[model samples]
Target: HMRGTLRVGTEATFPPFGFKDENGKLVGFDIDLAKAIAKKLGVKVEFKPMDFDGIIPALQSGKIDVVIAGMTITEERKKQVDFSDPYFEAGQAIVVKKGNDSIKSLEDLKGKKVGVQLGSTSEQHVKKVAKDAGVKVKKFDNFSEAFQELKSGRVDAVVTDNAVALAYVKQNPNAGVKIVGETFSGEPYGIAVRKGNSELLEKINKALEEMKKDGTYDKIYEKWFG
Candidate 1:
């Protein structure tokens, strides 16, 4: 008998990790990895797209079996759902006007206007973690707006997800913006499963390990990254 389908949750707005392709098809690194994981589990894969914040609750409510979204592993989120071993290393990147050698890293943003998406992890980093009392924060609704603010020479920099920052800059090479410095406050992205779902969790982890032990993981990484 065939096993039940594995329904995964995600947000398609995030590029390389999850996004709509030219034909309106759902495709990305996580989408591919989830299909591979499903193959290892001897089941088909289905993805349910929703707002990022709602994915966890959907899993808890049994609307989805697991979440393979590029969601960061945070202590606050851990309280609600169980997370598989981390699969992606992500962090914040500082984006500034091209040729701006002065601001290479977080500490270099002193007395500068930094734009960030309101209520995002990047904003939290600027307000809570950086400890740069001189850095002024400008809140925007989305990342493009923040990046534009940086382009207009209004904000000194924009801090956001390193992966997304890379994608945006790569897509627009001559936008007069560049991502500078090393990724800071690194965080790991994990697969989310309902709390205490040990059996499903084990299967997912086993597939993840096997993928890395072989060359599957590297292939996927390079396809999206390089």
Candidate 2:
């Protein structure tokens, strides 16, 4: 058991993971999961929504207790923050206009504009690799804007988390967007905590394991991804 509110940071712009509803209220898989974990810890959950890029900094500065955004666990990021056990499996996906056959693979992205969330693994991939192949990368604060740019013809394609891309395409079937090519670069999503916060990390991991054992994890997954 714990005391005080458990401050959780997230970017509520990625649908199915975290996003605002029609009533402007934060709602999604991550939000529900955070609440569940907080309940297990015997604390109130206080969600703090901000730019995804600033989440780590906010944690470092003690502005938030933890981050539950669909943030991928990476070695480089581990230097700045500790992570809970892997919560969700994810991969990168390339999104393009539906029925467009001009670009069939990553090679076809050369000389084309691509949109990605700022400070995301997609941005790292685009900058480190795709750019050298001649793809121009544009950064957005969130995937929604990156997808908006794709819909408006501002970008030729978008590289983002496969699950998020699928959620968007599924919800907006007529939006003319579709995931193309195979999902690549497997990664796992983890709840982020401040570096050296091992105590909290342990509690989070325990809660996650219990959720999985009790079928709570699968229920949340199906609610969002099914």
Candidate 3:
């Protein structure tokens, strides 16, 4: 039999993927997906919001049962946590203030200060692209704070997931921010379970497959991304 509440850790600051709504309640694609998976497992979901960099540690320390925070399934992460089947396709994107022609692409960001979420693939990508250009990569606990830095002129650009960048731009149409480059370094988002936790991993994968087969996955995708 399934046990107690399924504790799911997420950084509730990435819109469309995971973020708080007007009422201060967490509501996003990952939130819904986690709830659905928990329902399939015949348990309630308990969402624990925390810094993006702390999510993996929370899982490792037994504070959370899973992480569904738009996390990419990287080889390094695979060694620490088992991942569910790929649920979303994602890629890094560059965002800059509108009317700022100074940066038209990743190459143009040379020597500029870029903001990125700590411990994220964006940070890794930006570091690699900025290594030879003398660019500075600032790390934040969440992408929203990184975007805020860009808005405040503290950073020249913000590198984040393409979908998230677009969502932020749309959410704050007057914020003067826009995505300015083609998406790069495509990856897949996955639900992460503690390493060796095969029972929970199997249940999550099964629920994901069922959701896909029953159109629940399509509905959630269209609701958020469409």
Candidate 4:
């Protein structure tokens, strides 16, 4: 058995990714993956739930050993923390009030304002798109806040990962939000580790790769996202 426990940082508010279930227990794809990885390493697993935007900072502060949240690896974030091999691939999508067909695509967003969660890959992608398209964007602390902004008509749309957007739409059926526009560029979810922590990163990558190879990965994917 390994000598110590592995502390994992995550946001427990994202369903199908990481969230508290009906039993009020934290259980989701991220939770299962963390537990599986810890078992492979012969160690105990502990999840530290924090604000989505604060996760990276917590990792940098040595408050956790790694982050298993569905964090997409981007060139900009690489400057903050190292990432493991890609685990899941997703793309950006737009969520707007239902029956609002006027904003059907990113092209429809010209000169308009959109909302995105801060410190998220969605924020980065949205900001990049807006900059190139000459649109305006606003940042919020989390999905809840961003969705609230959309509900109040403070923003025309809320751009985020397709998976998370779908989850939000499902949870708030009466919120009148619908996903519009085709998915943007492909984004991959990866495990984040402290920069230069090659040993831990290597172990995590190995475990994740093994899961993918042994069909365990697909099982988890089906359980949560299928």
Candidate 5:
């Protein structure tokens, strides 16, 4: 019933994964993945930039057809969206301002203020880490601001996605920060579709697996991340 455009809702904030470029163009690894999947499905792709909070709401309402991450595939979210097979393994990283090796890892964040995206998996993880490690967590809606709070000396460090931390550090010349310690447990990233949309979900998974076999997936990953 739907051989038309596959509408995608992404906040475009996480660079290299998904974000607006200096030219205000939205492009990233996930961006291209959708394009490739669309090509396979014989449909055009349409991207709608919105916040993370709205990703599931829009998809559930059928306002958009896909989102890179609709909520880290939680059990609660599972009731609302059908998730594609895990595509990217994710972990959380500790980011500190340059020359700040004191907070090398989660252990070192004890008693220090850390910034994270509000309601994010990183936040949830750190909150649990907060209690165990004696770390205080500050929450934000976006990573750029999380990074900003770190640079402004308002927050001592930032807990963020491993891919995002790597991307922000490498892709931005003036990021002025560094990743420390091994990344913490990252949930595997999955493609999000409305619940019961088995047809499109299977199409997405087919394109994904084909991309991996044909090297399309590797090319997209390397173009942005490698």
Candidate 6:
């Protein structure tokens, strides 16, 4: 009894959240969550992989029906799109060169060059923090590029979600990058729909709630980073 196909946008480069497996098919926590929601609504999922920052524009222009990317709900973004209730809660922190103890806290970022993924809450958060601390900010196309920049010393540090920062550190212990500073803000992630699409938003939210209730959410979480 599927009504119509649902197009979902995600940046497949963000692993554990959304990424491509070795086989090249999209697979990960976000992908699984989106697929589960699609099934619940009796619809087919068509995933459109795009840059992290471009996902929002993609949805706004009707290039996609929804965005299941690990996007945080922010006041600034709410002006552009409607977000469902938060499905994931996260914390923010800094990732810096290992052994660089000088930048141990947010207040220590003064005059530092901080990098963040373009179009992410991390970018906004970094800018806000940097403005307050008198630091410079650089935005990258994706988390991968941002981390690479950090590894190559293009920036003094990176500001991003703790889960993402932790995953990168776990994967690249030899890259000389480690998370510094405790997480600062409560980042709540939600699925995004075009502004005012209450019908679709309501359905997706119901599916999300059901997933949590039935243990599907935990299964997906464990499959990625348990």
Best by lDDT: 3
Which structure is stronger by TM-score: 1 or 2?
A: 2
Q: Summarize candidate 5's per-residue lDDT along 1-226 as a digit string, tens digits.
A: 7668888888777876788888998888888888888998899989998877778899989799888742466776788788998888777788888888697777677889999887677777677767866777887767788888877789888887887887767755686788887564557788998899898899899988999999999998888767
Candidate 5 global CA lDDT score: 0.80
Query: Where in model 1 is the C-alpha error above 4 Å?
Result: 1-3, 99-102, 110-113, 117-120, 129-155
TM-score of each: 0.82, 0.95, 0.95, 0.90, 0.89, 0.93
Total clashing pairs for each candidate: 0, 0, 0, 1, 2, 0
Summarize candidate 3's per-residue lDDT along 78-164 as a digit string, tens digits. Answer: 988899999888987888988788898778888898998999988888778787889988899867888889988999999889888
* 45-134: candidate 2 lDDT, tens digit per residue: 999999999999999999999999999999999999999999988887888998678876667788899898999988887777674687
The lDDT of each candidate is 0.83, 0.88, 0.89, 0.85, 0.80, 0.85
How many clashing pairs does model 5 include?
2
Write model 4 residue lDDT over 1-226, tens digit each, in one string. Answer: 4447899999876666888878989998889999988987888998999888998899999999999988988887899999999988878789998878789877788778888877887777667667667788888766778888888889889888787788888988888889987584488888999998899999989998898899888888998878
Better of 1 and 6 by lDDT: 6
Task: Return the TM-score for candidate 6, rounded to 2 decimals.
Answer: 0.93
Residues 195-217, candidate 1, lDDT per residue (tens digit)? Answer: 99988899999999999999988
- For model 6, residues 1-55, the per-residue Cα lDDT tens digits are 4458899999876777887777998987789999889988998899899988888
Best by TM-score: 3
Instruction: After superposing candidate 3 on the true structure, give the runs of residues whose Cα lies further than 4 Å from its correct spot.
Output: none
Off by over 4 Å in 5: 132-134, 171-176
